[PDB]
Symmetry: C5
Subunit: 362 residues, 5 copies
């Protein structure tokens, strides 16, 4: 237990077997739920005080909510006594995700008045995955009509496109953002016995052509179908997020690229006690770009069962951020990136995307 | 004997009603409330909120500020017959300010509706309905009687319509504190008119004793969410202190049963017995976490239960660091330690008991 | 002539006999009139630059204009060569008084769209007194129709109310504010031979019941007719303003209470050379509340012919404020209160409300 | 050539004989014309970047444009090679003068939606003089319709008023502002053979009654026809501006008062090398009020052919302001007043208002 | 060869096309342009200008920023076939951002009209038209062909309608730089379509040489104003550098005649021949006055004329004080010395010549 660390890696990995979250995870849930008005999961309303206080840029709120939600889904698997609370928070998550504050960039940028109708997989992929996870956790059909409608839109759009998948902004294809959408299809299928996930093989074949550098185990930044262009830089955060989600659909795909990913991007330091992750090739700097390579790699390490790397990354990420528990609730004095408490929460509890898919009923 | 940094003895606060007079520091708080033109909080009926802008009161809290002032004014009316007219006048202002959009408008801004009274929002309309009743008990005026009947009928109907006992605040958030205000407003209505709206109280007291309370610790959980059935797994001291204080006016035995356990669970006596401070939740040594009101609401609860020792301990903790002075016969705190600070200290200093407010004799 | 004092008390009191204002009063008039655009009496328009530069709160602008106006009226009596200028400034005063910036608090507070129609004596009492004074000074009938219309409203409202007088905000009765209104009736009567002032005796009888403490010579803060409440604090500024105005209508009333007022509130200090005024009972602090007790008492001392107290108060008030005459125009580096230059101006020139009433024609 | 001075007084006065502006006047014209977007005479559009960068208050922008324009008219007389450029700048001047940013104070103050219709001679007097000067310089008829319309309005309003002239704001009469309007009538007459200028004699007779102190050679600050009031302070900037323009209409009028004006207001100092100008009587302070007495007196000295006083004033004004020439363009580090570069430019080039009137054609 | 604050040699920039590869620092500039989510300038087609807000680019200049990036991308396409698709993609984004109201809206705000294309405003629409043509040469795509034909016809018609050769920017302001862009857009249209819109070029080149140039100094005057006939009497180095660079792609002999004289008039070599800086006007020793772009546009000109020595001198002056650094394979300047700084340095580093862009072979 180094300074600035709250629990051992062994303890995080044991939560599910012990049917209990660690005290610090509980204290995170308290940050999420406790204080009136300002806690992020206080109400269904279009109130964003929590994100104003954290200074979360508007474009990022949608990811904040999504990643909290994916964490809450694993809380539900870990502790049956917390499943009702998790369901309640996922309900709030879904209802906040639909507020114009969250999606309104789509309109402000000039792309349309409806965030669901065509394109914008960055938003609606997450929303659709959230709808499914809500239902798996709770058994409630509150959103089932919307979920079916959005799942059908996604399916249809995939079928209509010459490339496998869907764009975010018009003409910008991102493999991370697609991975969320395809995973939402697997969840829908689990809930309804359908076969929307059959599209997955063609997508996995496609992202293995020009979009990946197979020797380095890394995806290029984006694809642009009008011109055919693949941006020539590889991206660590892009790859970590993508391999983590793909591991729940096609474990063998991620198992093949994971070791090469590590070789390409991960730097172990401080006599093996720490690790940090380079965002691109041709640099020794860690956490360039959006600054999320290390955080998404923490998640990936959790997904792949790599305790050693998880421990190394968390020794790098957590202590400089200065965690403390005040009134049984977790705060960080110095969050090192965007989506900081969200991604650390998620990675601490994450039961595996495959296990979320197979979640037993309430 | 007067502890350091304190304005009057606990013995003096408790004696106010028997002496038929407020202490000089309570009078000075009433001057802060009433004296200076335009900027005193009870200067006018208008939708003017200068006093709250100067205190930096967040908008979501203004409704509670007005409510707790009002509950204090009601006790001022019982304490000193010569101040009853003034207290009535201030309660009139209280009610009329409580209806300004500045106070309730969060309901609309959050997307929950254009009418703060129509359904849900018991956080707002519970207090408003209690204020309507108290105004009438103090003054004998029927100025708000129509509105009072209309709102009391809405509350009644909504309780009757719900599968759980009570009413939510936001949609799908149930809070026992907020309900307690509403049920109390029914008792006040019944006192004024001879009705039996309060009959719903027993089913509510049975209900909050099921999953919402930890009976061994004497503490309520934070909230309930009827759609999912979830009860948030943290107990809360401010929630419990507020709820037990109000319930004591409806069912004294309920609060007497839980009060000693509440104290064991949350209250930390320190400084060789001279002080006390209150933990907001279990699993922590930190005092006044969360909203930071556990100590202040526990001061009120102590007053309600007649617990002079704990009152004295809490006020020794709360008041001195806040640095009271009286300038021009008016009370200011240099360093208020929390939200609702002068409000709750005023209320607790004068509070005659919710039961005694209920039975308040006419003018 | 102590430091920070510009002229002797003997000189202020001699202005009228010498038919000339002191050089520092002339310099105040220059501050009022000289510089294009930013001087307060530059134009009729709804331009408030002068008050923005002084940081005058909006609620106070109406009193600023009023007290300037009452001063200008005495300038007209003092120097026949300045009477035309004074008339001009009063014209501007009246027209600025009618701008929404001045009265608009009435609407913003929710009390109505018309500042004249009902209640709001705090505004319309002053406006009605200004209309009369304008006419006495100039002989002009520019506002006569409005003056008659407003005088009739005031008269009718007094007649309609069970208590003697008119409220400011609904349910708030203030004796200061009423005193202005009753004085406006005396001025109307002087100009037109009417008997609106007959209501005065019933008002003077009324304010001597629960509204005054006759032993201490002090009025309570306010009265609230719905509840019957009289606020239990006495107020020095309230009483000083009221007694000054009443002295013009019923000199004996003010002569009876003035000595007792001084005993109650006035603190002589610095071996008789200075004085400062406590705002309420039960305190040794001076100039609490709105912070105007000393300034209004300066006015009262002028009204009562009390040279000694005037001198004492001005020794307290003027020097710490650091007067400066640059060009031939008066500025204060450190005004000690609201309405600072207004009230010092007024008190320096004030010829008595009774003398304004009997002002000979142009 | 003292420090902080760019050319000799002898050189400024010789520009017209040499048919060339001095290098520093050229560098001023470069400041006016050179840089993209931020130069004041870059475009016809309603863009005011240049005035935002100088922090020019909105009420003053109309005078800035006017005084630049009067300077450009003299540039046209001085150098035939610069006349086309001067015409171009005057075109821009006229078109910017019509933007709401310039005149909109009229509306904001509550006086009306049309700046031309009635009163507001402060704006429309300058606009009308600018129209005429534009035409004299260029021969273009682009604004001739507007010029005839505005000249008729001015003529009619003079004819309708019981006093000789026109007010600015309602009930404020200023002789400076009138002098511009009357001069505009002389320019119209020169262009069209009309006799609008016949009104001039009645105006000159009028301003010599209560509006001037003939012994001191100084005009009072303003006149207010409703009350009959003349403000009792004399003003140096008011008088300097008025006498300069009147010299182009009735040279004998200004020749009579100029020596007395100097005795009253001008202080020679620094062993005869400098001068500075008091704004009013009863003070030793220089450049009080609006702070323009010295700058307008520089213009007057140029108009009267007083080389000695011009030199003295410029030695006072220019050096403390710290002129710099960078990229062949003139900047002042520390301008000492409003309208600083405008008035120094104007006074450096000014050929006399009489000579502008008699400007030979293109 | 390789001074401090320089990233690659002049010999390396000039060799890019022969080596069919951009230098690492040019690649790092493309990464600044393309890499980070949401804040990179070429992230999306949308009307999002975060990248320009972060650089503090004034709104009036955004149009030029986009244009000069675009001209640079066109040369990237000629240099490296493997980057041509990327360049096309970025040009697509360029065009679509150029059409946002944030870019052109000054036209409306200034009072000149609601439509930026309809008339005048060659400052905007000249660049837009050149961008349309370059997009099509790089990609083969006809996405903008209709708009390109429409705008090319407007320009052609307006030239034909005017008594002077060319088109104004603001009403009654004629600038030769701005015109040079428009005429060059006609040549690109003609390349793509076999038309003869470029025939107007000869009359324009004769015109700008009769009244708007000082032929001994090799320098254009600042502007022309047809209503008055006025030519502003100051010569301008940035105006001349930009104009001669573009004219070199249409009439090489015209620029070859004036280039040496331009240099004598404005260019100051210093530091024992290792550096150079450019005076903006005559009658001054100060460098980079006015808009402060003389040196940067002269850098471009030097590249266009094949003048390695002057290019090297200018870049030794411009680049090091700006403090270039490569962080995560992406180029940042700590202290950009002017407006359009990274744009113009990018452009000049890659610029293959306007004549070579015109003749660009198909994909």
């Amino acid at each position: 237990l180094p300074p600035g660390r709250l629990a051992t890696t062994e303890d995080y990995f044991a939560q599910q077997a012990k049917q209990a979250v660690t005290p610090d995870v509980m204290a995170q849930l308290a940050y999420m739920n406790y204080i009136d008005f300002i806690s992020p999961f206080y109400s269904r309303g279009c109130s964003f005080e929590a994100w104003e206080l954290k200074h979360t840029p508007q474009r990022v709120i949608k990811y904040s909510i999504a990643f909290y939600a994916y964490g809450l889904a694993s809380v539900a698997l870990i502790d049956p006594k917390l499943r009702a609370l998790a369901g309640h928070d996922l309900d709030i998550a879904v209802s906040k995700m639909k507020c114009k504050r969250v999606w309104g960039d789509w309109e402000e940028d000039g792309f349309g008045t409806d965030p669901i109708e065509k394109e914008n997989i960055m938003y609606k992929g997450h929303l659709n995955l959230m709808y499914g996870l809500y239902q798996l956790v709770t058994g409630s059909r509150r959103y089932e009509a919307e979920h079916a409608h959005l799942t059908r839109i996604i399916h249809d759009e995939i079928a209509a496109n010459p490339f496998a998948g869907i764009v975010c902004e018009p003409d910008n294809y991102f493999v991370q953002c697609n991975s969320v959408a395809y995973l939402s299809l697997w969840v829908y299928d689990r809930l309804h016995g359908t076969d929307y996930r059959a599209a997955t093989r063609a997508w996995l074949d496609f992202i293995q052509k020009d979009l990946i550098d197979p020797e380095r185990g890394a995806f290029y930044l984006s694809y642009h179908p009008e011109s055919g262009a693949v941006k020539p830089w590889i991206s660590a955060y892009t790859t970590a997020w993508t391999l983590a989600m793909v591991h729940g659909m096609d474990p063998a795909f991620s198992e093949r690229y994971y070791p090469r990913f590590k070789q390409t991007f991960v730097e172990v330091y401080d006599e093996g006690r720490k690790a940090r992750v380079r965002e691109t090739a041709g640099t020794d700097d860690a956490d360039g770009g959006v600054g999320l390579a290390s955080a998404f790699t923490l998640l990936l390490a959790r997904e792949m069962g790599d305790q050693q790397l998880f421990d190394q990354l968390l020794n790098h990420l957590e202590p400089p951020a200065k965690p403390s528990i005040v009134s049984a609730s977790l705060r960080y004095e110095h969050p090192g990136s965007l989506l900081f408490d969200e991604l650390l929460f998620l990675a601490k509890v994450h039961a595996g995307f495959g296990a979320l898919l197979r979640m037993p009923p309430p």
